[PDB]
Structures are given as structure tokens and as C-alpha cells.
Amino acid sequence: PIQTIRDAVVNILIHFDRNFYQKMKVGVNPRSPGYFIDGLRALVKLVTAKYQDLQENQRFVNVGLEKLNESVLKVNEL
Amino acid sequence: RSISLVKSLTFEKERWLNTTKQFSKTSQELIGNCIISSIYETYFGHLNERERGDMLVILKRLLGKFAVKYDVNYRFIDYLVTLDEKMKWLECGLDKNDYFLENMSIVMNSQDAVPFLLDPSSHMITVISNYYGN
Amino acid sequence: FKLFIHSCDPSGDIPIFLRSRVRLVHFVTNKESIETRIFDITLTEENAEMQRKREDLIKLNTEYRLKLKNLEKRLLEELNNSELMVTLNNLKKEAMNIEKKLSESEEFFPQFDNLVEEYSIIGKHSVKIFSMLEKFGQFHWFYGISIGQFLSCFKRVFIKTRVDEILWLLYQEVYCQFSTALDKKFKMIMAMTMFCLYKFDIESEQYKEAVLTMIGVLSESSDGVPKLTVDTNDDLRYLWDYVTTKSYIS
């Protein structure tokens, strides 16, 4: 039963994979689970890279705005 | 000069404020964007535009069923294909189609599994030859 | 080391071991591809200077946008590390110059949009003819069609009421080139359905109803009827005389 993001995302990946194999009309032929593994590896790598980039961009913009506000306050005080 | 620099940074300050405001929207979304990007990456290499649209709409409905957030205006090129990469692909000789750009981004973002190309026209053989030079 | 596998054979034979461990990508021509290609061909054959100016303007605009993004990134990185004020002044002056360059370069769009609206009918007719030829290609293995052959047919049209004249020459030349690739029954199929397509696009709705009645009575599916006007088009009178005299081949 779903408690965190992890259970929801693994359920959504499993259910989408089942739907995709259902549309393809594989019939009685076996379904290759290679697509699921490839998608999962791509998901973890891409979410790690995107989280790193987004956190770096956020702290970058935050320190830029902080420096600009500090300079504005220093100019206003003087 | 400092006063002029402060006064001229109105647009930059507005953009920074908009980015700070939309950081919550992006962080509420990032998992869903990564899921749909990876599904594009590993599922619709070998599908036409109609099948891609049907798969995408049923994926969007199913993803909204489990209540995880995603963009109402999400696109593959707007998320994975960068401006420098798009410039390089267009100057190599690729067409301007969104389908071709999506497939090109799918092919060049595969550092794990080798990509397979079914190009009847034999156009991106010389496009990729242009990309890697000599 | 990076490996790429290329194949020019659609619907080939990929082994299951190879199929299961690669990122299989198809590459087919869609509506947008043929429409953009035919717009480019007709523009570079009609007004070559206009097409060259348009493509140079597009390349300049995207390069200027890339330079603007890179300049914004450099400005942000430079201010993050803190003479300097003069550098920031030069950067924002260059950014303003880029912005006014875009503003001055974004004034040729209405002519391009008018050309798009003018030649959209040629684009849609071309993609419809290509769809019909692909239908022929999947009816039998010998009747396949390549996009390069179709584009070379356009080049032959342009080498050999103006847009209507281009469309007329297009239909005549594409029939005269791709009739020889089909047998007699598909020759009749292609000729009659293409004359039907032209007359449906050009003439009115009563003409469409009349032609549906003609094809239906020739198909033994629809009986009777026609909605023939009193001041008939002379060809329709001959066609109804032919079908009433049971001269089907005529």
C-alpha cells in the first residue's frame, strides 16, 4: 500500500508497462521485460542529474538575489 | 555606476523573483517530468506520431490517477534538447521537424544501450558523419 | 568508443537478442516533413533570393538567441563571483544590442506567413498524393514510393491564376511519371481517383455529389439518376451517356 513517492512511481511504471504490452498485441508470446529495466535505469540516472542541476540553479539564483539585496541595502544605508 | 547597475537590474530581479516563485512548481513536478522523459527515452523510439499521442494521453491519464504532478504544457524538446545541441543538429543537416528532433535526442542520449536506426532515406548517416567530423 | 547500427530496410528481420537490447528508432516521413520540404523547394525555385534571405534570417535569429542565453549565463556567473562594473555594463549593452537586433530582424514574418497561407494548398495536395502512393505501395510490393522520387518530380515540374497552374502541372507531371510504374488496373485507379481529387478540390459540392453518384453506379453499390444540373458541364453529359450506354471501359 502506497505511502511514499517510491511506491507510486514503481506502480505507475509497472502499470504503464502492462498497458504498453497490452496494446502491442503480443498474444501468447512472452513479453520482454528489457524495456522496463531500461526505463528504470534511465529514470534513476535522469532524476539524479536533474535534481543536482535544479538544486545548483536554485542555490545559484538564491545567492545572486541575496548579494543583490545586500548591495542594495548597503547603497541605501550609505 | 553602482546606482546605474542597480537600476538596470530590474528585469534580472523580476526574472529571479519568477524563478524563485516557480521553484516550488518545478520541485512539485520534477519526478513526473523525469518519468515522462524516461518513458519517451525508452518506449517511443519505434512508434509513429499517432501511437505516440495515444500512448502519451493514456500515460498522462494514468499518471494523474495516482496523483503525482506533471506539466500541463510538457514537451520533450523543451526539456531534453538544449539550444547548443539543437544548433549542432540543425547545422549537421537534420530537418526542422519535431518528430526528427525528438528521435535525434532519443538517439544521442543513449550512453548505455547502442541505438538502432531504420532510416530508409539514408540522411542521418551523413548527418551523424557530419556530427563526429573525421 | 560508441557504436551505431544503421539499416535502410523497413520491416526487416531483427533477431530477438538484438531487438531486446537496443533503442530501436524508426524514421519515416510525416506531413510536416513533406510540407516543409515542398515549401522550401517552391520558394528556392520561385524566389531564390527570398529563400536565401529567409534561411539566413532564421539562422541569425537562432544564433542571436543562443548568444543572448550564453550572455545571460556569463553575466550571472560573473555576478556570482562577487573593473567589474564596466564588464557588467558591457554585458548589458551587448544584451540590449542583441534584443534590438531581434526586434529589427523580426519584421519579415508577415510575408512568410502569407506565403505559408498561399502554398498550404500545394503542400496538402502533395501530401495527399504521397498518401495515395503509399497506399499503392502497401497494396503490392512493387509499387513502393520514395520521397526523393517525389521531390525530383517537383524539380522536373519547375524545370519544365498561377498557383492553379503550378497545381495543374504537378498533377500532369506526377501522372506522366508514375503511370508507368503501375499495371493497367492501377493505372485506371490512379488516373480516375486523381482526376476525382482535382475536381473535388476545384469544383463545387453538386459536382462532388455527381461524381459520388457516378462512382457508386460504377461500383454496383449506389443506384441512381444523379443530381445533374440543367446547364451541365459538357464532360459530365458524355460520362452519363457512356454509363447509360453500358460502355464501362469508355
Coordinates of C-alpha atoms in Angstrom, one line a residue:
Chain A
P1 CA 0.0 0.0 0.0
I2 CA 1.2 3.4 -1.1
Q3 CA 3.0 5.5 1.5
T4 CA 5.7 7.5 -0.4
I5 CA 6.7 8.6 -3.9
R6 CA 8.6 5.3 -4.4
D7 CA 5.6 3.0 -4.3
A8 CA 3.6 5.3 -6.6
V9 CA 6.3 5.6 -9.2
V10 CA 7.0 1.8 -9.3
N11 CA 3.3 1.2 -9.6
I12 CA 2.9 3.7 -12.4
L13 CA 5.9 2.2 -14.2
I14 CA 4.5 -1.4 -13.8
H15 CA 1.0 -0.4 -14.9
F16 CA 2.2 1.6 -17.9
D17 CA 4.4 -1.3 -19.0
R18 CA 1.5 -3.6 -18.7
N19 CA -0.7 -1.3 -20.8
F20 CA 2.0 -0.8 -23.4
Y21 CA 2.5 -4.6 -23.8
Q22 CA -1.3 -5.0 -23.9
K23 CA -1.7 -2.5 -26.8
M24 CA 1.1 -4.2 -28.8
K25 CA -1.0 -7.4 -29.1
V26 CA 1.9 -9.8 -28.2
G27 CA -0.7 -12.6 -27.7
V28 CA 0.6 -15.8 -26.2
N29 CA 4.2 -14.8 -27.0
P30 CA 6.4 -13.8 -24.0
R31 CA 6.8 -10.2 -23.1
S32 CA 10.4 -9.0 -22.9
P33 CA 11.0 -7.0 -19.6
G34 CA 14.0 -5.2 -21.1
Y35 CA 12.0 -2.0 -21.7
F36 CA 11.1 -1.8 -18.0
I37 CA 14.7 -2.2 -16.9
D38 CA 16.0 0.3 -19.4
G39 CA 13.3 2.8 -18.5
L40 CA 14.1 2.4 -14.8
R41 CA 17.8 2.9 -15.2
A42 CA 17.1 6.0 -17.4
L43 CA 14.7 7.2 -14.7
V44 CA 17.1 7.0 -11.8
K45 CA 20.1 8.5 -13.8
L46 CA 18.0 11.3 -15.2
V47 CA 16.3 12.2 -11.9
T48 CA 19.7 12.3 -10.2
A49 CA 21.2 14.6 -12.8
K50 CA 18.1 16.8 -12.9
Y51 CA 17.9 17.1 -9.1
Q52 CA 21.6 18.0 -9.0
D53 CA 21.2 20.6 -11.7
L54 CA 18.0 22.1 -10.3
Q55 CA 19.4 22.4 -6.8
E56 CA 22.6 24.0 -8.1
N57 CA 20.5 26.5 -10.1
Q58 CA 18.2 27.3 -7.1
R59 CA 21.1 27.9 -4.8
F60 CA 22.8 30.0 -7.5
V61 CA 19.8 32.2 -8.0
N62 CA 19.3 32.4 -4.2
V63 CA 22.9 33.6 -3.6
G64 CA 22.7 36.0 -6.5
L65 CA 19.5 37.6 -5.2
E66 CA 21.0 37.7 -1.7
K67 CA 24.1 39.5 -3.0
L68 CA 22.0 42.0 -5.0
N69 CA 19.7 42.7 -2.0
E70 CA 22.8 43.2 0.3
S71 CA 24.3 45.6 -2.2
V72 CA 21.0 47.5 -2.5
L73 CA 20.7 47.7 1.3
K74 CA 24.4 48.9 1.6
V75 CA 23.7 51.6 -1.0
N76 CA 20.5 52.7 0.7
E77 CA 22.3 52.9 4.1
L78 CA 25.1 55.0 2.7
Chain B
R1 CA 28.0 53.3 -11.7
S2 CA 26.7 51.2 -8.8
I3 CA 23.4 53.1 -8.8
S4 CA 23.0 52.7 -12.6
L5 CA 23.8 48.9 -12.2
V6 CA 21.2 48.6 -9.5
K7 CA 18.6 50.5 -11.6
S8 CA 19.4 48.5 -14.7
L9 CA 18.8 45.1 -12.9
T10 CA 15.0 45.5 -12.8
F11 CA 14.4 42.8 -15.4
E12 CA 17.0 40.5 -13.9
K13 CA 15.4 40.9 -10.4
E14 CA 12.0 40.2 -11.9
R15 CA 13.3 37.0 -13.6
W16 CA 15.0 35.9 -10.3
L17 CA 11.7 36.5 -8.5
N18 CA 9.8 34.5 -11.1
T19 CA 12.3 31.7 -10.8
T20 CA 12.0 31.7 -7.0
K21 CA 8.2 31.6 -7.3
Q22 CA 8.3 28.8 -9.8
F23 CA 10.9 26.7 -8.0
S24 CA 8.0 25.3 -5.9
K25 CA 6.1 24.4 -9.1
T26 CA 9.1 22.7 -10.6
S27 CA 10.0 20.7 -7.4
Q28 CA 6.4 19.6 -7.1
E29 CA 6.8 18.4 -10.7
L30 CA 10.3 17.1 -11.1
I31 CA 9.5 13.4 -10.5
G32 CA 6.7 13.4 -13.1
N33 CA 8.8 15.2 -15.7
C34 CA 11.6 12.6 -15.2
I35 CA 9.1 9.7 -15.5
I36 CA 7.7 11.0 -18.8
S37 CA 11.1 11.9 -20.1
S38 CA 12.4 8.4 -19.4
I39 CA 9.2 6.9 -20.9
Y40 CA 9.9 8.9 -24.1
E41 CA 13.6 7.8 -23.9
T42 CA 12.9 4.0 -23.7
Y43 CA 9.4 3.5 -25.2
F44 CA 8.6 5.7 -28.2
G45 CA 11.7 5.3 -30.2
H46 CA 9.9 2.9 -32.6
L47 CA 6.5 4.5 -32.7
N48 CA 4.8 6.9 -35.1
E49 CA 3.2 10.2 -34.1
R50 CA -0.4 8.8 -33.7
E51 CA 0.8 5.9 -31.5
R52 CA 3.0 8.3 -29.6
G53 CA 0.0 10.6 -28.9
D54 CA -2.3 7.8 -27.9
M55 CA 0.4 6.3 -25.5
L56 CA 1.1 9.8 -24.1
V57 CA -2.6 10.6 -23.4
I58 CA -3.2 7.3 -21.7
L59 CA 0.1 7.7 -19.8
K60 CA -1.0 11.2 -18.7
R61 CA -4.4 9.9 -17.5
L62 CA -2.8 7.0 -15.7
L63 CA -0.2 9.3 -14.1
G64 CA -2.9 11.7 -12.9
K65 CA -4.8 8.7 -11.5
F66 CA -2.1 8.1 -8.9
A67 CA -1.9 11.8 -8.1
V68 CA 1.7 12.8 -9.0
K69 CA 2.3 16.2 -10.6
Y70 CA 3.3 17.0 -14.2
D71 CA 3.2 19.9 -16.6
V72 CA 0.1 20.8 -18.5
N73 CA 2.4 22.1 -21.2
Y74 CA 5.2 19.5 -21.1
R75 CA 7.3 18.7 -24.2
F76 CA 10.3 16.5 -24.9
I77 CA 12.4 19.0 -26.8
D78 CA 11.7 21.8 -24.3
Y79 CA 13.2 19.5 -21.6
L80 CA 16.0 17.4 -23.0
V81 CA 17.2 19.0 -26.2
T82 CA 19.4 22.0 -25.4
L83 CA 19.9 25.1 -27.6
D84 CA 23.5 24.2 -28.4
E85 CA 22.6 20.6 -29.2
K86 CA 19.7 21.8 -31.4
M87 CA 22.0 24.2 -33.2
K88 CA 24.5 21.4 -33.8
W89 CA 21.9 19.0 -35.1
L90 CA 20.4 21.6 -37.5
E91 CA 23.8 22.6 -38.8
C92 CA 24.8 19.0 -39.4
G93 CA 21.9 18.7 -41.9
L94 CA 18.9 17.4 -39.9
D95 CA 15.5 18.6 -40.8
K96 CA 13.4 21.0 -38.7
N97 CA 10.7 18.5 -37.8
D98 CA 9.7 18.0 -34.1
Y99 CA 9.5 14.2 -34.7
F100 CA 13.0 14.1 -36.1
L101 CA 14.4 16.3 -33.3
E102 CA 12.7 14.1 -30.7
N103 CA 14.1 10.9 -32.3
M104 CA 17.6 12.5 -32.6
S105 CA 17.5 13.5 -28.9
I106 CA 16.5 9.9 -28.1
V107 CA 19.4 8.5 -30.1
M108 CA 22.1 10.8 -28.7
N109 CA 21.0 10.4 -25.1
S110 CA 21.8 6.7 -25.0
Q111 CA 25.1 6.1 -23.3
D112 CA 24.1 2.6 -22.0
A113 CA 22.5 0.7 -24.9
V114 CA 23.5 1.1 -28.5
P115 CA 20.9 2.8 -30.8
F116 CA 19.3 1.2 -33.8
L117 CA 18.4 3.4 -36.8
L118 CA 15.9 2.5 -39.5
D119 CA 16.5 5.3 -42.0
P120 CA 15.2 4.4 -45.5
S121 CA 16.4 7.7 -47.0
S122 CA 20.0 7.4 -45.6
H123 CA 20.1 11.0 -44.5
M124 CA 21.3 10.9 -40.9
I125 CA 24.1 8.5 -41.9
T126 CA 25.7 11.6 -43.3
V127 CA 24.2 13.8 -40.6
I128 CA 25.9 11.7 -37.9
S129 CA 29.1 11.7 -40.1
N130 CA 28.9 15.5 -40.0
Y131 CA 28.4 15.4 -36.2
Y132 CA 31.6 13.4 -35.4
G133 CA 33.8 15.0 -38.1
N134 CA 36.6 12.9 -39.5
Chain C
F1 CA 34.1 4.0 -28.3
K2 CA 30.4 4.5 -29.4
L3 CA 28.5 2.0 -31.6
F4 CA 25.7 2.8 -34.0
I5 CA 23.7 0.4 -36.1
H6 CA 22.1 1.6 -39.3
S7 CA 19.6 -0.2 -41.5
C8 CA 17.8 1.1 -44.6
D9 CA 15.3 -1.7 -44.7
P10 CA 11.9 -1.1 -43.0
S11 CA 10.1 -4.2 -41.8
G12 CA 13.3 -6.2 -41.9
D13 CA 14.4 -9.1 -39.7
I14 CA 16.0 -8.2 -36.4
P15 CA 16.9 -11.1 -34.1
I16 CA 15.3 -11.2 -30.7
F17 CA 18.7 -10.8 -29.0
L18 CA 19.4 -7.7 -31.0
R19 CA 15.9 -6.4 -30.7
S20 CA 15.7 -6.7 -26.9
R21 CA 18.9 -4.7 -26.1
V22 CA 18.9 -1.7 -28.5
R23 CA 17.0 1.5 -28.7
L24 CA 15.0 0.8 -31.8
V25 CA 14.1 4.1 -33.6
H26 CA 12.0 4.4 -36.8
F27 CA 12.5 7.3 -39.2
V28 CA 9.5 7.9 -41.5
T29 CA 8.3 11.0 -43.4
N30 CA 5.3 12.7 -41.9
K31 CA 3.0 15.5 -43.0
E32 CA 5.2 18.3 -41.6
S33 CA 8.3 17.0 -43.3
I34 CA 6.9 16.8 -46.8
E35 CA 5.1 20.1 -46.3
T36 CA 8.3 21.9 -45.2
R37 CA 10.3 20.3 -47.9
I38 CA 7.9 21.3 -50.7
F39 CA 7.7 24.9 -49.3
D40 CA 11.5 25.1 -49.4
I41 CA 11.6 23.7 -52.9
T42 CA 8.9 26.0 -54.3
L43 CA 10.5 29.0 -52.6
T44 CA 14.0 28.3 -53.8
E45 CA 12.6 27.7 -57.3
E46 CA 10.4 30.8 -57.4
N47 CA 12.3 33.4 -55.4
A48 CA 15.7 32.1 -54.6
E49 CA 16.9 35.4 -53.1
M50 CA 13.9 35.5 -50.8
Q51 CA 14.5 31.9 -49.6
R52 CA 18.2 32.5 -49.0
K53 CA 17.4 35.7 -47.1
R54 CA 14.8 33.8 -45.0
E55 CA 17.1 31.0 -44.1
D56 CA 19.9 33.4 -43.3
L57 CA 17.5 35.4 -41.1
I58 CA 16.4 32.2 -39.3
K59 CA 20.0 31.2 -38.7
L60 CA 20.9 34.7 -37.5
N61 CA 17.9 34.8 -35.2
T62 CA 18.7 31.4 -33.5
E63 CA 22.4 32.3 -33.2
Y64 CA 21.5 35.6 -31.6
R65 CA 19.1 33.8 -29.2
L66 CA 21.9 31.4 -28.3
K67 CA 24.3 34.3 -27.8
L68 CA 21.7 36.1 -25.6
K69 CA 21.3 33.0 -23.4
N70 CA 25.1 32.5 -23.1
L71 CA 25.5 36.2 -22.3
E72 CA 22.9 35.9 -19.5
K73 CA 24.7 32.8 -18.1
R74 CA 28.0 34.6 -18.2
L75 CA 26.5 37.7 -16.5
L76 CA 25.0 35.5 -13.7
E77 CA 28.3 33.6 -13.3
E78 CA 30.3 36.9 -13.2
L79 CA 28.0 38.5 -10.6
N80 CA 28.1 35.2 -8.5
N81 CA 31.9 35.7 -8.1
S82 CA 31.4 39.0 -6.2
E83 CA 36.6 46.9 -13.4
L84 CA 33.7 44.5 -12.7
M85 CA 31.1 47.2 -13.1
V86 CA 32.5 48.1 -16.6
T87 CA 32.3 44.4 -17.5
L88 CA 28.6 44.3 -16.4
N89 CA 27.9 47.5 -18.3
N90 CA 29.5 46.0 -21.5
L91 CA 27.5 42.8 -21.0
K92 CA 24.1 44.5 -20.6
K93 CA 24.9 46.8 -23.6
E94 CA 25.6 43.7 -25.7
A95 CA 22.4 42.1 -24.4
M96 CA 20.4 45.3 -25.4
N97 CA 22.1 45.3 -28.8
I98 CA 21.0 41.6 -29.3
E99 CA 17.5 42.5 -28.2
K100 CA 17.2 45.4 -30.7
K101 CA 18.8 43.1 -33.3
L102 CA 16.0 40.6 -32.8
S103 CA 13.4 43.5 -32.8
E104 CA 14.7 44.7 -36.2
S105 CA 15.1 41.2 -37.6
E106 CA 11.5 40.1 -36.6
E107 CA 9.8 42.3 -39.3
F108 CA 9.9 39.8 -42.2
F109 CA 7.4 37.4 -40.6
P110 CA 4.1 38.6 -42.3
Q111 CA 5.4 37.9 -45.8
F112 CA 6.5 34.4 -44.8
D113 CA 3.1 33.8 -43.2
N114 CA 1.3 35.0 -46.4
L115 CA 3.5 32.6 -48.4
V116 CA 2.6 29.8 -46.0
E117 CA -1.1 30.6 -46.4
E118 CA -0.7 30.7 -50.2
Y119 CA 1.2 27.4 -50.6
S120 CA -0.6 25.4 -47.9
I121 CA -2.9 24.1 -50.6
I122 CA 0.1 22.8 -52.7
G123 CA 1.5 21.2 -49.5
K124 CA -1.7 19.4 -48.6
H125 CA -2.2 18.2 -52.2
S126 CA 1.4 16.9 -52.3
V127 CA 1.0 15.0 -49.0
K128 CA -2.4 13.6 -50.2
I129 CA -0.8 12.3 -53.4
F130 CA 2.0 10.9 -51.4
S131 CA -0.5 9.1 -49.1
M132 CA -2.2 7.7 -52.1
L133 CA 1.1 6.4 -53.5
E134 CA 1.9 4.8 -50.1
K135 CA -1.5 3.1 -50.3
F136 CA -0.4 1.8 -53.7
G137 CA 2.9 0.7 -52.1
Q138 CA 1.3 -1.3 -49.4
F139 CA -1.2 -2.8 -51.9
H140 CA 1.6 -4.6 -53.7
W141 CA 5.3 -5.0 -53.1
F142 CA 6.5 -3.5 -56.5
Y143 CA 4.5 -0.2 -56.2
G144 CA 6.6 1.4 -53.5
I145 CA 7.2 5.2 -53.4
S146 CA 10.2 7.1 -52.2
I147 CA 10.2 10.7 -51.0
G148 CA 13.3 11.5 -53.2
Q149 CA 11.4 10.4 -56.3
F150 CA 8.5 12.7 -55.5
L151 CA 10.8 15.7 -54.8
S152 CA 12.7 15.1 -58.0
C153 CA 9.2 15.1 -59.7
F154 CA 8.7 18.6 -58.3
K155 CA 12.1 19.6 -59.6
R156 CA 11.1 18.3 -63.0
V157 CA 7.8 20.3 -62.8
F158 CA 9.7 23.5 -62.0
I159 CA 12.4 22.9 -64.6
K160 CA 9.8 22.2 -67.4
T161 CA -4.3 32.0 -61.9
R162 CA -0.7 31.0 -61.1
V163 CA -0.9 28.6 -58.1
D164 CA -3.6 26.7 -60.0
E165 CA -1.1 26.4 -62.9
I166 CA 1.5 25.0 -60.6
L167 CA -1.0 22.5 -59.3
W168 CA -2.1 21.6 -62.8
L169 CA 1.5 21.0 -63.9
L170 CA 2.1 19.0 -60.7
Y171 CA -0.8 16.6 -61.4
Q172 CA 0.0 16.2 -65.1
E173 CA 3.7 15.5 -64.4
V174 CA 3.2 13.2 -61.5
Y175 CA 0.7 11.1 -63.5
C176 CA 3.0 11.1 -66.6
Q177 CA 5.9 9.9 -64.4
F178 CA 4.2 7.4 -62.1
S179 CA 1.7 5.8 -64.5
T180 CA 4.5 3.6 -65.9
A181 CA 5.2 2.1 -62.5
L182 CA 1.7 0.5 -62.3
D183 CA -0.2 -2.0 -64.3
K184 CA -3.4 -1.3 -66.3
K185 CA -5.9 -1.6 -63.5
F186 CA -3.9 0.5 -61.1
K187 CA -3.3 2.9 -64.0
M188 CA -7.1 3.4 -64.2
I189 CA -7.3 3.6 -60.4
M190 CA -4.7 6.3 -60.1
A191 CA -5.9 8.4 -63.1
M192 CA -9.6 8.3 -62.1
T193 CA -9.0 8.9 -58.4
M194 CA -6.6 11.8 -59.1
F195 CA -9.0 13.5 -61.6
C196 CA -11.6 13.0 -58.8
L197 CA -9.3 14.6 -56.3
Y198 CA -8.6 17.6 -58.5
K199 CA -12.3 18.1 -59.4
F200 CA -13.3 17.8 -55.7
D201 CA -10.8 20.4 -54.7
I202 CA -11.7 22.8 -57.6
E203 CA -15.4 22.4 -58.3
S204 CA -18.5 22.8 -56.0
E205 CA -20.5 20.4 -53.8
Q206 CA -23.0 19.5 -56.5
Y207 CA -20.0 18.3 -58.6
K208 CA -18.9 16.2 -55.7
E209 CA -22.4 14.6 -55.3
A210 CA -22.5 13.9 -59.1
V211 CA -19.1 12.2 -59.0
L212 CA -20.1 10.1 -56.0
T213 CA -23.2 9.0 -57.9
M214 CA -21.0 8.1 -61.0
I215 CA -18.5 6.1 -58.9
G216 CA -21.3 4.4 -57.0
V217 CA -23.2 3.3 -60.0
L218 CA -19.9 2.1 -61.4
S219 CA -19.4 0.2 -58.1
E220 CA -22.8 -1.6 -58.0
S221 CA -23.4 -0.2 -54.5
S222 CA -25.3 3.0 -55.0
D223 CA -28.2 3.0 -57.5
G224 CA -29.2 6.2 -59.4
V225 CA -30.4 9.4 -61.6
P226 CA -27.7 11.9 -60.5
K227 CA -28.0 15.5 -59.1
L228 CA -27.1 16.8 -62.6
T229 CA -27.5 20.5 -63.2
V230 CA -29.5 21.6 -66.3
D231 CA -26.6 23.6 -67.6
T232 CA -24.3 20.6 -67.4
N233 CA -20.6 20.5 -67.7
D234 CA -20.1 19.0 -71.1
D235 CA -17.9 16.2 -69.9
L236 CA -20.5 15.1 -67.4
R237 CA -23.0 14.7 -70.2
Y238 CA -20.6 12.5 -72.1
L239 CA -19.8 10.4 -69.0
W240 CA -23.6 9.9 -68.2
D241 CA -24.1 8.9 -71.9
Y242 CA -21.2 6.4 -71.5
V243 CA -22.7 4.9 -68.3
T244 CA -26.2 4.7 -69.7
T245 CA -25.0 3.0 -72.9
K246 CA -23.3 0.5 -70.6
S247 CA -19.9 1.3 -72.1
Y248 CA -18.0 0.9 -68.9
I249 CA -14.5 0.9 -70.4
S250 CA -15.2 4.2 -72.2

